[PDB]
């Protein structure tokens, strides 16, 4: 009951900021996550014995891939923690509980390859789940880990509170499929502009939670420039591995994924900030004004990529 996680002073302060990097010490990430749960949710949300066992099984079920790894899980949960803390009163207790767990589990058992690569490979997961393939797999893995003896962190919820939280997690994890992001954001854009947006409308909330998940998933573009730039190498290491595997199936990959076209990366970032990241944080800032620092950081990094192209680094 009376056992707080505490962090050293620098982490204790910086963790509250959107741009916090969780650092290179793996062994501190579980504690960082427990800390965020205790402050976002309370010291009672979860049995510490069970939360700890759940965290360590989730960690075990992330693989040693360059980008889609346990550090990404904890990073994406931290961005959600900063959103929730800067919008205290807008979110239910169930939503605070469910959304940090959703972020921690959102990429469970990722191999580092896109839904498209699975489909071209004819991976069994592509037959089991025709759309949002890896994302249906991540939610599946989440439910399995929740079902291990000792791992059900939700078991103190009422039956219907339980059904609601699993349904928050499922929708949240599916929304990390970027193929669905474009439509979701357009629809949120129209609702915000015509003024029909209503957060007491579950389907409207669902959409806003989906945009939050896209925002947290892409949060590498909202870091200090050196974090952003070094993460992009991890991101590209997976993309180029996928390009290699495409070439193996006898398919020329799109240039983003072709390691023979490293030159073209700074420009491919511009497309990505302009087509994806800036629109996502713009709509997010319109709907939840206190998330503006993510838009400001994203804009700073677009400008740093413009500088790379202009030879100036």
Name the residues annotated as catalytic.
68
Half-sphere exposure of 157 (CA within 13 A, CB side): 19
- Beta strands of the chain (E only): which ranges? none
Which residues, including other chains, have CB under 8 Å from residue 278's CB and lie 6 or more apart? 295, 298, 299, 302
Instruction: List residues forming the annotated binding site for 3',5'-cyclic GMP.
Output: 68, 269
Q: Is 211 exposed, middle or buried (0-12, 13-18, 19+ CB in 10 A)?
A: buried
Per CB under 5 A, contacts with Zn ion among 195-224 are: 217
What does the block give as tokens for 22?
């969780």
Q: If binding is defined by CB under 5 A, does position 177 make contact with Zn ion? A: no
Q: If binding is defined by CB under 5 A, does position 242 make contact with Mg ion? A: no
Q: Are 124 and 110 in contact (CB under 8 A)?
A: no
User: Among Mg ion, ligand IO7, Zn ion, none, what binds residue 230 when CB lies within 5 to 8 Å by partner kind?
Assistant: none
Q: If binding is defined by CB under 6 A, does position 221 make contact with ligand IO7? A: yes
Q: If binding is defined by CB under 6 A, does position 73 make contact with ligand IO7? A: no
Helix (H) or strand (E) holding 104: helix 93-105
Half-sphere exposure of 181 (CA within 13 A, CB side): 22
Nearer to ligand IO7, 149 or 263 (CB): 263
List the x/- string, 248-287, binding to Mg ion by CB under 5 A: ----------------------------------------
Nearer to ligand IO7, 30 or 268 (CB): 268
User: Among Zn ion, Mg ion, ligand IO7, none, what binds residue 37 when CB lies within 5 to 8 Å by partner kind?
Assistant: none
User: Among ligand IO7, Mg ion, Zn ion, none, what binds residue 115 when CB lies within 5 to 8 Å by partner kind?
Assistant: none
Which residues, including other chains, have CB under 8 Å from residue 139's CB and lie 6 or more apart? 105, 169, 170, 173, 174
User: Among ligand IO7, Mg ion, Zn ion, none, what binds residue 235 when CB lies within 5 to 8 Å by partner kind?
Assistant: ligand IO7
Q: If binding is defined by CB under 6 A, does position 180 make contact with ligand IO7? A: no
Among 95, 107, 238, 258, binds Mg ion (CB under 5 A): 107
Per CB under 5 A, contacts with Mg ion among 162-181 are: 176
Question: Could you tell me the CA-to-CA distances from 218 to 82, 153, 278 in Å, in that order?
Answer: 14, 27, 11
Nearer to Zn ion, 107 or 177 (CB): 107
Q: Minimum distance between the CB of residue 218 and ligand IO7, rounded to whole angstroms? A: 5
Q: Which of 273, 263, 269, 242 is nearest to 68 (CA)?
A: 242
Residue in this structure with the two tokens 């219907």, named with its chain if needed:
160
Which residues, including other chains, have CB under 8 Å from residue 5's CB and lie 6 or more apart? 31, 34, 35, 38
Q: If binding is defined by CB under 5 A, does position 109 make contact with Mg ion? A: no
Instruction: List residues forming the annotated binding site.
Output: 68, 72, 106-107, 217, 269
Q: Which of 110, 111, 87, 109 is nearest to 99 (CA)?
A: 87
List the x/- string, 222-241, binding to ligand IO7 by CB under 6 A: ----------x--x------
**Residue 275 three-state SS:** helix
User: Among ligand IO7, Zn ion, Mg ion, none, what binds residue 51 when CB lies within 5 to 8 Å by partner kind?
Assistant: none
Per CB under 5 A, contacts with Mg ion among 115-134 are: none
Give residue 292's Cα distance to chain centre.
18
Q: If binding is defined by CB under 6 A, does position 276 make contact with ligand IO7? A: yes
The footprint of Mg ion (CB under 5 A) covers 107, 176
């Amino acid at each position: 009951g009376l056992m707080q996680f505490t962090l050293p002073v620098r982490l204790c302060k910086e963790i509250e900021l959107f741009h916090f990097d969780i650092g290179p010490f793996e062994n501190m990430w579980p504690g960082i996550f427990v800390y965020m749960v205790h402050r976002s949710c309370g010291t009672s949300c979860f049995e510490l014995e069970k939360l700890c066992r759940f965290i360590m099984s989730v960690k075990k079920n992330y693989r040693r891939v360059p980008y889609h790894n346990w550090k990404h899980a904890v990073t994406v949960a931290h961005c959600m923690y900063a959103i929730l803390q800067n919008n205290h009163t807008l979110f239910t207790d169930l939503e605070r509980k469910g959304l940090l767990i959703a972020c921690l589990c959102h990429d469970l058992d990722h191999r580092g390859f896109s839904n498209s690569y699975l489909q071209k490979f004819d991976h069994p997961l592509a037959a089991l789940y025709s759309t949002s393939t890896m994302e249906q797999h991540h939610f599946s893995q989440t439910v399995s880990i929740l079902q291990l003896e000792g791992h059900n962190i939700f078991s103190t919820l009422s039956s219907s509170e339980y059904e609601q939280v699993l349904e928050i997690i499922r929708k949240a994890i599916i929304a990390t499929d970027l193929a669905l992001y474009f439509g979701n954001r357009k629809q949120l854009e129209e609702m915000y502009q015509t003024g029909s947006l209503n957060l007491n409308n579950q389907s409207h909330r669902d959409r806003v939670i989906g945009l939050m998940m896209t925002a947290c998933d892409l949060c590498s573009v909202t870091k200090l420039w050196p974090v952003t730039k070094l993460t992009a190498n991890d991101i590209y290491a997976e993309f180029w591995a996928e390009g290699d595997e495409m070439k193996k199936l006898g398919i020329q990959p799109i240039p983003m994924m072709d390691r023979d076209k490293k030159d073209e990366v700074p420009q491919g970032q511009l497309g990505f900030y302009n087509a994806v990241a800036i629109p996502c944080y713009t709509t997010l800032t319109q709907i939840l004004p206190p998330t503006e620092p993510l838009l400001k950081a994203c804009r700073d990094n677009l400008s740093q990529w413009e500088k790379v192209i202009r030879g100036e680094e």
